Amino acid sequence: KFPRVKNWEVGSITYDTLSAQAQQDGPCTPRRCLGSLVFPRPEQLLSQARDFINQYYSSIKRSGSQAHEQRLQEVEAEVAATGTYQLRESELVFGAKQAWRNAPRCVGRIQWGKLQVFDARDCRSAQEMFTYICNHIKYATNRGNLRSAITVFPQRCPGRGDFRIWNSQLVRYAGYRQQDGSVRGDPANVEITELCIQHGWTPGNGRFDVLPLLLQAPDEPPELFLLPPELVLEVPLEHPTLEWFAALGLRWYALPAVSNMLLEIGGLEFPAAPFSGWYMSTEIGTRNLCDPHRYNILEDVAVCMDLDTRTTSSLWKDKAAVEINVAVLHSYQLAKVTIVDHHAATASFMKHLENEQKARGGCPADWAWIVPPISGSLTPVFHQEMVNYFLSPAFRYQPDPW
Amino acid sequence: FPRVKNWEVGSITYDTLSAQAQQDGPCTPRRCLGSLVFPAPEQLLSQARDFINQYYSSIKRSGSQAHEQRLQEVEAEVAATGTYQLRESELVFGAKQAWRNAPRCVGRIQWGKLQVFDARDCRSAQEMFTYICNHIKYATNRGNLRSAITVFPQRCPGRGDFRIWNSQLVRYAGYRQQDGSVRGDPANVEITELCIQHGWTPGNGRFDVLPLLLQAPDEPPELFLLPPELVLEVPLEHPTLEWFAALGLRWYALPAVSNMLLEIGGLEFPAAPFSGWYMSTEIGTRNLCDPHRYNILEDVAVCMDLDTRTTSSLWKDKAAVEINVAVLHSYQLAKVTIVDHHAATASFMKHLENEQKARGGCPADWAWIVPPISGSLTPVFHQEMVNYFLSPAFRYQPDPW
Numbered sequence: 001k002f003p004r005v006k007n008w009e010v011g012s013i014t015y016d017t018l019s020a021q022a023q024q025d026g027p028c029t030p031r032r033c034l035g036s037l038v039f040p041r042p043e044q045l046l047s048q049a050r051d052f053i054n055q056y057y058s059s060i061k062r063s064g065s066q067a068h069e070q071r072l073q074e075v076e077a078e079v080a081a082t083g084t085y086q087l088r089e090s091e092l093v094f095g096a097k098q099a100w101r102n103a104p105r106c107v108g109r110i111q112w113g114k115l116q117v118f119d120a121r122d123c124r125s126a127q128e129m130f131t132y133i134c135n136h137i138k139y140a141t142n143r144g145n146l147r148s149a150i151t152v153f154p155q156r157c158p159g160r161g162d163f164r165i166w167n168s169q170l171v172r173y174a175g176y177r178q179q180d181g182s183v184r185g186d187p188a189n190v191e192i193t194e195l196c197i198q199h200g201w202t203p204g205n206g207r208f209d210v211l212p213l214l215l216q217a218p219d220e221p222p223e224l225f226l227l228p229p230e231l232v233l234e235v236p237l238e239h240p241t242l243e244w245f246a247a248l249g250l251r252w253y254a255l256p257a258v259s260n261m262l263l264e265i266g267g268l269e270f271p272a273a274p275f276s277g278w279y280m281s282t283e284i285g286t287r288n289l290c291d292p293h294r295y296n297i298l299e300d301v302a303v304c305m306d307l308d309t310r311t312t313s314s315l316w317k318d319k320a321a322v323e324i325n326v327a328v329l330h331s332y333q334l335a336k337v338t339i340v341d342h343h344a345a346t347a348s349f350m351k352h353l354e355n356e357q358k359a360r361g362g363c364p365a366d367w368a369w370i371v372p373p374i375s376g377s378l379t380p381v382f383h384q385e386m387v388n389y390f391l392s393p394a395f396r397y398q399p400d401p402w
Numbered sequence: 403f404p405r406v407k408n409w410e411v412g413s414i415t416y417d418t419l420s421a422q423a424q425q426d427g428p429c430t431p432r433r434c435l436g437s438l439v440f441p442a443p444e445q446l447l448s449q450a451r452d453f454i455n456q457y458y459s460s461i462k463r464s465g466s467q468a469h470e471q472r473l474q475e476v477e478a479e480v481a482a483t484g485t486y487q488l489r490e491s492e493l494v495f496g497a498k499q500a501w502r503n504a505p506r507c508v509g510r511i512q513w514g515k516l517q518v519f520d521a522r523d524c525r526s527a528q529e530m531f532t533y534i535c536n537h538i539k540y541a542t543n544r545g546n547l548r549s550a551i552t553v554f555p556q557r558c559p560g561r562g563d564f565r566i567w568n569s570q571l572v573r574y575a576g577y578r579q580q581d582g583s584v585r586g587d588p589a590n591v592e593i594t595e596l597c598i599q600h601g602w603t604p605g606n607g608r609f610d611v612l613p614l615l616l617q618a619p620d621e622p623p624e625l626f627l628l629p630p631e632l633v634l635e636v637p638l639e640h641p642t643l644e645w646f647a648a649l650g651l652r653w654y655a656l657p658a659v660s661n662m663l664l665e666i667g668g669l670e671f672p673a674a675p676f677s678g679w680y681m682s683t684e685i686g687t688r689n690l691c692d693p694h695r696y697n698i699l700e701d702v703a704v705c706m707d708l709d710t711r712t713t714s715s716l717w718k719d720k721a722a723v724e725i726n727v728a729v730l731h732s733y734q735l736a737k738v739t740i741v742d743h744h745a746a747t748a749s750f751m752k753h754l755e756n757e758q759k760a761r762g763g764c765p766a767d768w769a770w771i772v773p774p775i776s777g778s779l780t781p782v783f784h785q786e787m788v789n790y791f792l793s794p795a796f797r798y799q800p801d802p803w
């Protein structure tokens with residue numbers, strides 16, 4: 001009943017006893033595994049609140065002692081009198097760190113203890129959001145010395161609309177169709193780009209136009225917000241030795257800040273809780289720039305490198321991709337913007353796994369997402385067996401607000 | 403029915419084939435164990451019955467006289483003997499289905515083109531060896547490799563199993579060294595010591611081909627040396643890094659898995675070696691660059707003048723790419739069949755599309771299908787996959803020692 005977990009590079013073996021605590025059923029059954037699917041599809045609130053409060057108090061070595069029981073009664077009374085409860089500041093903080101710590105697909109969780117939590121739970125109106133989001137971005141960006149941060153907007157309440165950020169991230173590039181359907185800019189954001197335009201935004205022409213924000217106060221159709229350009233830190237992409245690479249005109253932004261995910265703590269739901277860290281270079285260099293449905297630049301870079309693109313066995317794709325990742329790391333470091341390569345990132349994650357084995361008896365890890373999209377087996381996580389499961393508190397995906 | 407998305411294209415299918423998943427895998431709704439490497443006549447009858455139904459559907463004779471004849475024949479043979487024998491055509495179909503059903507095999511576009519050698523009359527370890535040598539000779543085909551399987555007698559009550567103790571027909575020895583290191587392939591230290599313990603006179607090279615340890619029923623394993631001219635090998639050189647040849651690296655032409663169990667209609671063939679041809683990343687990335695295998699990555703990178711003192715130079719990625727280039731180039735030079743990971747994953751995408759039409763799905767183990775370098779540069783990365791167990795099947799089995 002305790003999954004045996006082997007590391008095949010070293011031969012070491014552990015048991016994931018933490019998996020025994022998994023709440024939300026995953027997508028897999030004895031009959032079929034659905035682990036590669038990206039998205040795999042009233043007093044229930046007190047059981048989740050009780051569980052979260054007990055978590056909080058064990059983590060401060062204060063289980064079964066005065067303040068713990070007292071806090072147990074106050075949430076009991078709060079839900080009894082109001083049908084919900086409010087998180088203590090320290091709990092909201094602790095829950096944010098735990099949701100991050102529990103994110104199975106996050107390779108950066110060695111950082112999970114260092115998280116700046118901005119409490120925007122007294123927020124009201126999209127204008128207020130924009131200043132919170134702008135405080136977050138400026139704090140997180142910090143002139144390129146990136147700092148992990150989350151801003152927690154008001155929780156979900158019955159019978160009243162949600163706070164929602166319509167953009168999937170706080171910084172996204174536009175995607176413009178043509179007299180031929182095809183896209184100039186980021187093809188991933190064709191939808192939100194067409195929403196921003198349909199809500200008043202004057203579209204640009206370029207391949208790297210920072211989209212405006214669509215911020216949704218409860219029961220209000222959204223409002224457009226132009227992000228201050230001096231607040232959107234971008235990195236022009238150059239290559240250390242390929243002088244023509246800069247002339248390709250590629251850029252990427254500094255701050256990866258996911259703004260479409262729902263933070264769930266102790267049964268409470270925060271559909272607006274944008275979190276940010278810093279990039280792993282393969283996210284930009286491999287996925288964003290080289291995915292065929294993203295900027296799809298692989299062949300252009302290979303033409304410029306004079307690679308033989310006529311045969312797949314020249315591994316021209318592999319070479320061009322590696323140089324793109326080199327350009328990303330070089331450019332971010334030259335711009336003094338925090339970035340981590342997939343080798344450092346995965347080695348730190350192995351350290352995270354070892355810590356968590358000792359601290360909690362295991363670690364929910366989603367192999368397909370932890371292993372980087374290039375050089376998978378050159379990283380140690382490739383050879384590490386992993387167990388994937390849902391712990392609470394958590395970041396969950398949620399439907400598009402339209 | 404699971405919904406399955408391709409993210410490169412946007413297309414969506416439903417894996418209705420998974421609903422027929424026979425045996426159960428390791429995952430539950432509580433926890434996914436997809437990443438783990440190694441997760442009674444009545445039930446023999448139902449397995450047999452289902453395989454016979456599969457066979458008669460393949461020959462467009464489902465529900466016919468011959469079909470029921472075979473069902474009744476097998477039921478009465480199981481009643482009288484506890485087991486039954488496959489007809490030759492059923493064995494051929496069952497071996498191909500087992501390949502077709504192998505979720506971690508990216509080469510399955512080829513599944514219909516499989517040469518089946520019926521060695522079920524095999525009598526001894528000496529005859530087993532001859533069959534194996536003929537398999538290797540046929541499959542290698544002077545470098546124009548041909549997919550093949552040799553099926554040795556099935557498990558049956560009252561006699562031990564035929565077993566090949568080697569995990570592949572061609573493996574390089576791994577010698578634990580004077581100072582705890584391994585000379586050769588560290589994956590093969592165990593089988594190497596077994597060969598020595600069974601009378602083999604070791605070498606001391608890094609690429610010494612292992613003898614075969616062949617087990618006839620209720621027999622100790624018997625040592626058989628492969629004639630060197632049967633084992634086609636490829637010296638490894640790089641088209642533009644002339645020092646690469648001086649590494650003295652080699653690999654063999656024929657990937658021939660010999661330790662897996664073939665299961666057809668409830669019958670078990672513990673010895674049924676099968677062989678195809680390599681995908682270059684198995685050699686270039688895993689066998690040569692895994693830290694626990696030949697572990698040549700840093701040595702190559704140092705020779706390439708890469709800056710190995712910092713991970714962000716991507717020296718590892720650069721050196722691995724050139725090792726893979728060297729593998730492809732060397733096998734092409736030698737005129738030994740090889741497929742690179744771009745061509746293999748593109749042909750696997752066609753396999754999934756063919757299988758969606760033919761069967762309504764395809765068991766695929768994403769983490770094994772996605773190559774170990776350049777994952778998201780291949781189309782399979784962006785393909786969601788459903789992993790499940792269909793029979794006939796190749797199964798792992800315990801080592802016989």
Ligand code: HEM
Pocket residue numbers: 096100102103104105106107108109111115148149150261275276277278279280283340345369395396
């Ligand atoms: C500090 C540096 C960080 C790095 C290098 C990092 C890296 C990554 C990467 C590469 C992914 C894969 C996403 C994809 O490829 O689409 C990911 C996912 C994710 N990360 Fe992190 N991240 C960091 C910080 C954070 C923070 C601060 C949070 C929240 C407080 C967080 C929570 C998540 C979540 C929710 C996901 C989605 C996958 C899941 O829900 O399991 N990460 N991260």
Ligand code: HEM
Pocket residue numbers: 497500501503504505506507508509510512516549550551662676677678679680681684741746770796797
């Ligand atoms: C014809 C060219 C072939 C190619 C290019 C190919 C490719 C591969 C690769 C790359 C793997 C993963 C191995 C690893 O990383 O350890 C694999 C596994 C496997 N292949 Fe194939 N293969 C071929 C032929 C065959 C044949 C002829 C058979 C059997 C009749 C077969 C059955 C299997 C099996 C059983 C596995 C183990 C995975 C599982 O049990 O699901 N393959 N193959």
Ligand SMILES: CNCc1cc(C#N)cc(-c2cc(C)cc(N)n2)c1
Pocket residue numbers: 256257258275276277278279280283287
């Ligand atoms: C890979 N680019 C899209 C992306 C998707 C998701 C998710 N879910 C998460 C990230 C992300 C988030 C954070 C905090 C850091 C990071 N390096 N990536 C980035």
Ligand SMILES: CNCc1cc(C#N)cc(-c2cc(C)cc(N)n2)c1
Pocket residue numbers: 509657658659676677678679680681684688
């Ligand atoms: C990748 N090196 C080890 C290896 C393990 C297993 C298994 N199971 C299978 C293969 C293999 C087998 C066949 C027939 C072809 C091929 N390219 N690889 C190779």
Ligand SMILES: C[C@H](O)[C@H](O)[C@H]1CNc2nc(N)[nH]c(=O)c2N1
Pocket residue numbers: 035036037038368369370409783784785786787
């Ligand atoms: C189909 C497949 O599961 C999907 O493309 C996944 C695979 N692994 C991933 N890993 C990361 N880090 N990010 C991703 O978007 C994905 N996508």
Ligand SMILES: C[C@H](O)[C@H](O)[C@H]1CNc2nc(N)[nH]c(=O)c2N1
Pocket residue numbers: 008382383384385386437438439769770771
């Ligand atoms: C632990 C991890 O599952 C393991 O290293 C797997 C991952 N995917 C693989 N994929 C292939 N094709 N071959 C392998 O050996 C492995 N190893």
Ligand SMILES: [Cl-]
Pocket residue numbers: 256283288
């Ligand atoms: Cl991103």
Ligand SMILES: [Cl-]
Pocket residue numbers: 657684689
């Ligand atoms: Cl191999």
Ligand SMILES: [Gd]
Pocket residue numbers: none
């Ligand atoms: Gd030029």
Ligand SMILES: [Gd]
Pocket residue numbers: 642643644
């Ligand atoms: Gd040269």
Ligand SMILES: [Gd]
Pocket residue numbers: none
């Ligand atoms: Gd040397």
Ligand SMILES: [Zn+2]
Pocket residue numbers: 028032033034035429433434435436
């Ligand atoms: Zn699973």
